[PDB]
């Protein structure tokens, strides 16, 4: 146990050993077997972690002095025995990373650091009389263990996110991000690993580990904040920026081929434009993917949020290369629906419809349809959507002033200087008035929303929230304001709403009721 | 009278004393004006045709030329004598909003 471990450690680091070296080297197989037997059988020993750390230090000293560097004459068993013990320690570390029932925090979370420090020191300590950093075999074995290491259900976290494997999360914390070369060599070994058939039939499966590996805005190809190096001599790894981008492109598309689940579908759609689309040589390859995500018409009831998420990447793709989605404003008119105000992603869509409806080549009937439908949607809505709908209607009416007949029709005004025949005609036409707005029309220009009027905002002027009602008072106020800073009005939530309500500007004193609800308190007492 | 181009028109020019060409949407249509009636329509673009103009009698193999500019980068030249067939085009570095010739 700990006694034999510390004695064998002192013997291995003492001066030299041959038979005791053989015993303390075959003892690591026994330590691996004991940990593999106690896996989900003891789960609290820490002698296993001490044995891994001690065998790491012993093999580190053995790779310092007696490594399998080269040979001159008749040392044809010492190098084979030392490399055999080092390869068995590495294979035990890879089995230790692959075989773990759950987040046991020792047998994988220390074997990862063991294989990492082993390859980090084994950059040198070979025949390489140059500037190599060749871990490639050990690294390919590391990542195939890292993707075979399936835990219980923390992969594909069915609420949101990517994967909650503890050692993979620690890897993307400090063993993937903080440098340049090991992520590049990871992408290269990944895009060699996805080409032999058995490994690719296993590697298109657990994609969530890779989503957790990538969605972090801290890549070596991303020029926002760049890194340093820990490896002694990096072998033209940072040079081929084309090779990193091309590898990133092809493994992205090749594992986007495989077993799309809806949660990680929405995850890659949300990160599609701000995270990965600059790291593509040809981003037109994703155009088919997000155009079918945009016109996704599925029977699934939560498959109505994915057009709203495909919009950002698809519009950035159109803008960078002017391709066309036909019937664009018809599809954008049918995308607004009562789901879109109750959805989680409102500000992400409305800060894009700011750009879509500011176009100088569209019609007053089109903007009329887009605000009359939005008002009939906003009459049954949270204030989170009220306070982003009504300044949007303000800015659209301010940019298309012909749409102020929906707020103010001058044919329905009774001034005191009128003919009796005029007030007669006024009474007959306001009795023979019916509004022509039809919600089931698919065409914005063919919707009669200019010929209709806009009652929903006037009804909205009496709202339970004072800030919301005083914001809706501006449609009876004049229009001296030019615009409203929609990105300042956008993401007001229930939580931040009552946060600012508890942390408001002044503080009046509360009052009491003189109503005396003595017996009947509600109508329910 | 009224000529029902179905898309919202962006430009209307007059070629003959009789026929006029309206662009709007992905196509352009030509209309005989003595008979109130459409007779050609070319929809050879991806996005909306923003503008048109027309040339006559200039030193050219083409005796007349209608060129059309279409919000996707393209400006194309159509020959009114063989049924408004496209003969040449230029691609530009962004959406082309207006065009003209000498």
């Amino acid at each position: 146990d700990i006694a034999k471990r510390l004695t064998a450690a002192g013997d291995r680091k003492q001066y030299n050993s041959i038979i005791k070296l053989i015993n303390e080297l075959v003892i690591p197989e026994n330590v691996t077997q004991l940990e593999e037997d106690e896996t989900e059988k003891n789960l609290r020993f820490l002698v296993m972690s001490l044995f891994q750390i001690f065998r790491k230090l012993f093999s580190r000293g053995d790779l310092t002095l007696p490594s399998s560097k080269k040979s001159t004459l008749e040392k044809e068993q010492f190098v084979n025995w030392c490399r055999k013990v080092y390869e068995a320690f590495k294979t035990k570390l890879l089995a230790i990373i692959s075989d773990i029932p759950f987040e046991t925090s020792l047998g994988l979370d220390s074997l990862d650091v063991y294989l990492q420090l082993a390859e980090l020191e084994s950059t040198h300590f070979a025949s390489e009389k140059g500037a190599p950093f060749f871990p490639n075999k050990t690294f390919r074995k590391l990542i195939i263990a890292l993707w075979s290491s399936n835990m219980g259900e923390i992969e594909d976290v069915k609420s949101s996110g990517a994967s909650e494997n503890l050692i993979i999360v620690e890897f993307t914390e400090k063993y993937y991000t903080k440098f340049a070369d090991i992520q590049y060599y990871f992408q290269s070994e990944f895009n060699q690993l996805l080409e032999d058939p058995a490994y690719q039939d296993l590697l298109l499966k657990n994609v969530g580990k890779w989503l957790a590996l990538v969605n972090h805005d801290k890549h070596c190809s991303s020029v926002d904040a760049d890194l340093e190096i820990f490896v002694p001599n990096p072998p033209q790894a940072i040079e081929n920026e084309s090779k990193f981008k091309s590898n990133f492109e092809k493994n992205w598309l090749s594992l986007l081929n495989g077993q799309l689940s809806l949660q990680q579908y929405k995850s890659i759609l949300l990160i599609l434009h701000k995270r990965i689309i600059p790291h593509f040589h040809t981003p037109t390859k994703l155009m088919d993917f997000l155009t079918d995500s945009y016109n996704l018409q599925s029977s699934n009831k939560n498959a109505g949020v994915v057009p709203i998420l495909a919009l950002n990447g698809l519009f950035e793709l159109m803008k960078r290369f002017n391709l066309e989605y036909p019937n664009f404003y018809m599809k954008l008119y049918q995308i607004i629906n009562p789901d879109l105000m109750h959805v989680k992603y409102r500000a992400r869509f409305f800060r894009l419809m700011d750009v879509f409806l500011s176009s100088t080549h569209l019609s007053a009937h089109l903007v009329a349809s887009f605000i009359k439908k939005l008002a009939r949607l906003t009459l049954e809505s949270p204030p989170s959507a009220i306070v982003t709908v009504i300044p949007f209607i303000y800015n659209l009416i301010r940019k298309h002033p012909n749409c102020m007949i929906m707020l103010h029709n001058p044919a329905f005004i009774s001034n005191p200087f009128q003919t009796p025949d005029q007030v007669a005609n006024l009474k007959t036409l306001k009795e023979n008035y019916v509004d022509p707005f039809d919600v089931h029309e698919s065409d914005p220009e063919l919707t009669h929303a200019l010929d209709s009027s806009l009652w929903e905002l006037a009804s909205l002027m009496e709202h339970y929230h004072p800030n919301v009602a005083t914001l809706a008072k501006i449609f009876a106020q004049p229009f001296k304001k030019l615009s409203y800073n929609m990105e300042d009005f956008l993401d007001w939530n229930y939580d931040s709403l009552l946060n600012a309500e508890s942390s408001r500007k002044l503080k009046t004193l509360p009052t009491l009721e003189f109503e005396a609800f003595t017996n009947v308190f509600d109508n329910e007492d | 009278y009224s000529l029902n181009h179905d898309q919202p028109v962006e430009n209307v020019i007059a070629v003959s004393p009789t026929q006029i060409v309206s662009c709007g949407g992905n196509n352009f249509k030509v209309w005989d004006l003595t008979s109130n009636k459409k007779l050609y329509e070319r929809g050879n673009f991806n996005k909306a045709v923003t503008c048109l103009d027309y040339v006559e009698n200039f030193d050219s193999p083409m005796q007349s030329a209608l060129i059309a500019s279409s919000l996707d980068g393209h400006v194309k030249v159509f020959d009114p004598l063989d049924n408004f067939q496209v003969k040449f085009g230029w691609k530009f570095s962004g959406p082309v909003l207006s065009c003209a010739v000498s």
Binding site: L253, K285, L323 | -
Partner: peptide, 17 residues
């Protein structure tokens, strides 16, 4: 859902239109 590849056929279609 998709299960075929990420192709380039919208690009090709509005190249040939």
């Amino acid at each position: 859902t998709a299960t075929t590849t990420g192709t380039v056929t919208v690009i090709l279609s509005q190249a040939l239109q």
